[PDB]
Design a protein around this ligand. Structure first.
Ligand code: F
Ligand code: F
Ligand code: NA
Ligand code: NA
Ligand code: NA
Ligand code: NA
Ligand code: NA
Ligand code: NA
Ligand code: NA
Ligand code: NA
Length: 398
């Protein structure tokens, strides 16, 4: 294997965090106090999530259902953002072009007020809502609200400046599909390019969100969006499916590969799962962390808001995926996903020249969950075994 060369002087995106969705209406119950602590604490056997996504109910008389878990997350320092699936029923019309609903242009001002008022309500409930998005999956909307890519751009350019209670997030595409994709009539990356290309829409859009359903690694690179000066969040996914129990192994390792790809190929600042607590989620219905959740935790517990992704040899051997981050205490955190069936010894080196003063490893695999050990080092480098089908997070003191 190539030595993994890490360079603290070459910086990419700032990390906003890692999280999941809470949706009492659709999940059937809210998180309990124990589950809230399990998700948003960063102590022993806690997921260390730092972002919570919440639901914008079309009926404002139901907004209160989102509040208790948002307040808990906010008290533990998490960013809280919200997504709408449908306008208030009085603003929505049946769609005859593939969606269930459509928002008529004549109702855009009222819809922006609906989103603004949700932000104000959250603030009055003690939650400074980080952002609200224009629409969940406007390009996969057979059961909610379809928007064309022109429509979301018009909304952002000409109406979203009146959302002042919170930041404005882009519409959230289903899968970040290539613009010329034959299977998507009007969606995917087109939602984003049209914002970048319209001065008013870009000025009124504070950050971007996309989902990752079926998103290939080869679709994650988006040069114009990655250089525009505003964060891109991956705001919803489950991988590789919802049909398997989240302890299924080695299937769960796909979660770590997907996070790695979003971080290093997509320059994503955030990675947000769907329901936190679910049979296929990071927390099981019995409240314990699943294998998929330990895959998330290898990132979320150690790559914290405000950390900066830095250069590190990304694929030193095929299907061994490496990313690295620095924090404001000058620690470097390296996450190595060995997705192969072979164990080998991997060397690491600080190309930026810093001497190492300590290395601690946390590792998850078929038989380990966040297993902790001390790693020897010498000068500017260290080496470690990477077992087959494992995720190793190295915390490096310089
Ligand atoms: F704005
Ligand atoms: F990229
Ligand atoms: Na940065
Ligand atoms: Na709501
Ligand atoms: Na907060
Ligand atoms: Na909704
Ligand atoms: Na209508
Ligand atoms: Na209106
Ligand atoms: Na989500
Ligand atoms: Na499996």
């Amino acid at each position: 294997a190539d030595t993994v060369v890490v360079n603290t002087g070459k910086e990419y995106q700032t990390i906003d965090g890692f999280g999941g969705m809470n949706h009492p209406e659709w999940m059937g119950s809210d998180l309990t106090d124990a589950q809230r602590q399990k998700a948003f604490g960063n102590g022993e056997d806690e997921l260390g999530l730092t972002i919570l996504r919440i639901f914008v109910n079309p009926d404002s008389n139901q907004w209160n259902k989102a509040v208790p878990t948002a307040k808990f997350a906010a008290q533990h320092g998490a960013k809280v953002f919200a997504s709408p699936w449908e306008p208030p029923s009085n603003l929505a019309e049946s769609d005859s072009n593939g969606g269930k609903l459509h928002l008529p242009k004549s109702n855009y001002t009222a819809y922006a007020q609906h989103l603004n008022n949700f932000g104000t309500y959250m603030k009055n409930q003690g939650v400074d809502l980080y952002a609200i998005s224009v629409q969940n999956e406007p390009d996969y909307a057979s059961e909610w609200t379809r928007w064309s890519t022109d429509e979301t751009t018009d909304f952002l350019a000409n109406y979203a400046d009146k959302i002042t209670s919170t930041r404005v997030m882009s519409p959230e595409s289903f899968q970040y599909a290539p613009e010329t994709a034959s299977w998507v009539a009007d969606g995917g990356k087109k939602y984003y390019t049209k914002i970048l290309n319209n001065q008013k829409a870009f000025a009124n859009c504070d950050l971007f969100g996309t989902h990752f359903y079926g998103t290939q690694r080869a679709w994650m690179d988006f040069p114009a969006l990655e250089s525009c000066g505003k964060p891109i969040w991956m705001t919803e996914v489950y991988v590789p499916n919802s049909s398997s129990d989240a302890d299924t192994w080695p299937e769960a390792l796909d979660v770590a590969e997907n996070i790695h790809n979003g971080m290093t190929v997509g320059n994503m600042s955030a990675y947000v799962w769907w329901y936190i607590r679910r049979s296929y989620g990071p927390m099981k219905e019995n409240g314990n962390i699943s294998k998929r959740g330990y895959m998330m935790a290898q990132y979320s517990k150690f790559v914290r808001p405000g950390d900066v992704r830095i250069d590190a040899t990304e694929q030193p051997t095929q299907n061994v995926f490496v990313s690295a981050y620095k924090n404001d205490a000058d620690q470097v955190t390296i996450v190595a996903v060995n997705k192969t069936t072979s164990e080998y010894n991997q060397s690491f080196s600080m190309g930026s020249g810093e001497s190492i003063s300590g290395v601690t490893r946390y590792r998850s695999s078929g038989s380990e969950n966040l297993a902790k050990s001390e790693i020897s080092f010498n000068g500017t480098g260290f080496a470690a075994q990477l077992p087959a089908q494992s995720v190793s997070t190295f915390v490096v003191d310089l």
